Symmetry: D2
Subunit: 358 residues, 4 copies
């Protein structure tokens, strides 16, 4: 069958909205409503990522992994039906001990055990028709969420990261002697989509949060943060210290390690940003000593499990029913598929750009 789709030739690069031949084999058939894009989609189009590739036999890869889909047809089951809106899983499991319990996000082997829709050998979701198995679909249960549900994928990564935070913070009593997180200080390096999502969950877990960047911020972003009780600071003018939770979305060694030197005893550092091109920063013996004497834990986190998608939907609902303006304002452009230039340049004031599908 012939259908419309946004494809790349991974890892060589390029993007075209075009026609392709997708035949059927499956438990469910779906179509897109919205599909977000992130740095990775752009990295794929730029040919900056060596780990991506087309599915076996084929010479293109359908882009798109941040999806909100609609069930057109479905097998016989007690969980979803025609008309239901769903978020598909990006990462699908291999055979390892972690994959086989639904924690492909903690895949013990890496590629080629696990695979990612739109990224590694699995067609993405920017195409008219999509076949899948029921278990790779997560039901949206809040009817008022609508398009905001497209933020699930970016948000699940945050929920897994926070899982990892909950795990490693058990090495000591991380809380105050009154049992709470009151006055505990979170700092998020960066002020884009992911940082925004980190900051909001942080707020829900009870931290005082403060996003940060190497420049002032738009009045758009500034107001959003205030709406969620989230501070901001240009670190070139006012450097925070005494940090209990450091989360990095920059990927820049120089910036990560300068903030690490502000981390409190028993502080946790979450590394989350890719930046393969970031310049090297010289980590010295004094830096190591600082980490050791303070029992600091630095943890890299990638992707997440199905359960985290569920958690993410629930949080989007709650935040939507309390600050709907600010949540809507996360999405900063909605785009036609033909508008393939969004993969090459960042619109003005972008936070999250999405593609509205016809």
């Amino acid at each position: 069958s012939t259908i419309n789709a946004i494809v790349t030739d991974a890892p060589k690069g390029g993007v075209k909205y075009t026609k392709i031949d997708m035949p059927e084999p499956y438990e469910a058939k779906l179509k897109p409503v919205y599909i977000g894009i992130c740095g990775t989609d752009r990295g794929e189009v730029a040919g900056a990522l060596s780990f991506t590739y087309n599915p076996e036999g084929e010479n293109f890869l359908v882009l798109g992994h941040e999806a909100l889909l609609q069930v057109l047809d479905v097998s016989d089951n007690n969980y979803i039906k025609r008309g239901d809106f769903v978020v598909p899983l990006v990462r699908r499991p291999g055979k390892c001990v972690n994959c086989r319990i639904g924690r492909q996000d903690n895949c013990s082997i890496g590629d080629p055990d696990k695979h990612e829709a739109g990224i590694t050998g699995l067609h993405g979701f920017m195409r008219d028709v999509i076949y899948d198995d029921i278990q790779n679909l997560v039901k949206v249960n809040d009817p008022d969420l609508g398009k905001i549900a497209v933020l699930t994928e970016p948000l699940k990564n945050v929920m897994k990261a926070f899982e990892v935070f909950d795990v490693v913070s058990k090495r000591s009593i991380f809380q105050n002697d009154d049992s709470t997180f009151i006055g505990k200080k979170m700092v998020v390096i960066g002020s884009g989509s992911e940082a925004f999502l980190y900051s909001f969950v942080g707020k829900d877990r009870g931290f005082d949060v403060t996003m940060v960047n190497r420049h002032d911020e738009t009045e758009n972003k500034m107001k959003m943060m205030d709406d969620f009780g989230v501070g901001f600071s240009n670190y070139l003018k006012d450097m925070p210290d005494k940090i209990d939770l450091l989360v990095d979305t920059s990927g820049d060694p120089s910036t990560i390690f300068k903030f690490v030197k502000k981390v409190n005893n028993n502080g946790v550092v979450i590394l989350f940003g890719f930046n393969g091109k970031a310049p090297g920063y010289p980590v010295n013996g004094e830096d190591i000593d600082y980490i050791v004497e303070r029992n600091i834990t630095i943890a890299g986190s990638v992707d997440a499990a199905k359960i985290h998608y569920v958690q993410a939907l629930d949080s989007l609902s709650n935040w939507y029913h309390r600050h709907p303006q600010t949540i809507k304002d996360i999405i900063t452009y909605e785009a036609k598929p033909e508008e393939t230039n969004i993969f090459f340049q960042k619109p003005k004031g972008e936070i999250k750009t999405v593609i509205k599908w016809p």
Copy 2:
């Protein structure tokens, strides 16, 4: 009252064996003398003026050295745990008031200095002196009569036990084990081949890991045969770099070496930073090294000191080891100095693994 003691002037430096005046409380829970006291690089750095965070106890102009002690009880008030003549290992770190210190987890102090303090290091006299008074709660009883001087290894080993606790905690972030539930075939690499590295390596094997110590030069045949007695491999890494590492521990304190081995860590791997050296040269960590850590769900954890429970675990291990491999355990202690030989704080004996002081 007047006693002999080995002292310094922290943080300035220097060392001397000498007479000093110390209080002689009539009221105390326990009164002890030292039998053996270990030295480590912190002692040597104290004495060389290399450590700036060390200080003398309030209103005093010396600091008695020594935090690795094996002591004997001279006298003690009625209690259910220890009595005159028993051997004990004293806690180094003493609790402040924070949430962690109040539960006996000062090793995880939330403030740092000056909430917690360490014997012979920060604001509290150490154990190289004729007489020592303490509370019972701060003493760990050696329950193995056969251990003798081996028990002086309790302090450097408890650091290892806490570090492995850190490992147990953080490795709960995914299934670390094989699909048969075990650690069989999991690979531990320990940067360094000194006494801390030996102790890490041995606990590693007890935990079921395949273990290899590594250094930037070949090792003595004695060390080699020690490693070989315990099933521990060695590798001069300039001739063959270990790869595919599940648990990596560093005792060097050296960035270049740390980050070089990080790049060989598997998915879900754990890196423990334990060593430190403030003089260590910088190493450029780039975006590529960050990504590597991220995409692998790697955890990098600093670990310092340990809790009293780790002292008990340490003693149990030293005893298990000694009753299996008595010789190689004895060979950890490579020199028994007298307190007059204060040059051991300056010059390392030849073939040093662990040097100790046999107190008069």
Copy 3:
């Protein structure tokens, strides 16, 4: 100062809405009044003289009732957290000195009474009185101005939050989730249809469970609309006994009902014991009942009270629930009685879920 307060004579019984002398205490940080106060079986059990463990404060001959409180700050010394006028829920359980109380986890007190004490229950005055003195630490600020009277539900919800904490701890003994990592179709059964049941059921739902409340009789259609509204089922187990349970929470305190539901619990099931009734008759647990528990690796966990942090989460859940289902959450508070109406303590408003007192 003379003030209005409803009091009792712990443990013996009875209640008056009367004046009492409430002096200004020697040291305190905040002065407060009540806005609303919830009531539960325990208050009704104190009035009936049905609790041997309660007692009046030291020296005094009366106990102010009321532990389920919403309060307003009349005055408070300057701090970063609360201002005059703010609304707060006060902690019921106050810390002693054990290793758990000193960290803010007096809910897990290691000693029991007299280490911890509970406002309105165990040597401490409850909140049904015109003026209240307290420290800031023991107050939980409402940060959602929309919540209003719903915030008086924080106390009963707090207990449920702790219990889900206990479930998250003990359920780590094995993989409780499906092989997709979720709880989809895991079955929670709650014994009971009272206020605590509903609160368990709603949290159950936020955790991903399929939830069914149960009882030995049908339920009023106000209850069935609330249930249906949150997606919670109901079943009368005399006509339809649920089977195959993954999480069983009892709010009844009735042995025989407990142990008959335990026999429907699956491998790796968790049983939370929460409700209590000292009057309930004995069910004869036999060799098989135990065998059933053992072979399935079931965990039966008793849970009492909660920590401050759980008050904070309780308040956050109510906020979420209120902005999603404002009417069903409002529908929980079935009566706003007056201090004067000291009959509530004795009789139950017809089809009560939660009875509150609007304080003048």
Copy 4:
């Protein structure tokens, strides 16, 4: 081909030492013979026909008995772990397909029969036969050569090691330790005085508990002496019941003894249900018993079987125990039988702790 075996007709019962055909399957990784095989209450139950969940392997009329085994490798495919002549302990429980089985945690099978199977008990042949074929992954290598026959205690001891893992998981709900981080003075009581109670106590002591076994009659001086060597106490609870219990382990399966000891358990106390007996009579549990559990945040966890890692842990402890107290470990083995003495399944030669079969 023809081999000797001891067999039952599960679940009917009976026992016989006889000849069976054992074909050499097409492909296998390992061929083994038994050296020693232990017997437990389960074997006696099987033979007695008292266990209705037991069954022969599909389309066979008999079931080879025996799950506590120590075997030697006759032949194995080349691999890096074991080789011919190596001694091993084979896994009793073999995995099915559920989320726990597939990660090597069949001991926590989410389904039970017939997902998981158990050698000698459920549809898989046991170890009392001349020849046994297995896969490597299912064998746990004995690394200490001095152990000898003592290594046959692995299987009963791995049950204990998993139950201590359950304890470690559940006791995270609060601070279970003293405020010095230790288990000093924490009280362990173990109901029963048989093989399992002894191994529970020894582990108990290694974890730092004060341990007391209890039974409802005095014990032979063989047993008492052994307790004494490991610093474990005993009490006939008819005469004297321990109180103030922090960890309670039951090996009786008897409700009345269980619940009577539950009412001695401290706040944050843990109870392990492990013993089972379907013939044990009912004992009334009332509202006030439930209430006692609730108010103390007690946890009651049933535990069955263990994972492969727990077999490896068991072997490590048996070594540690053997090099400290060789004579006393040997004494746990109280009778060595020849295969023709099938009497041991019906009558337990008195003074019994562990009866074993030496395979000729």
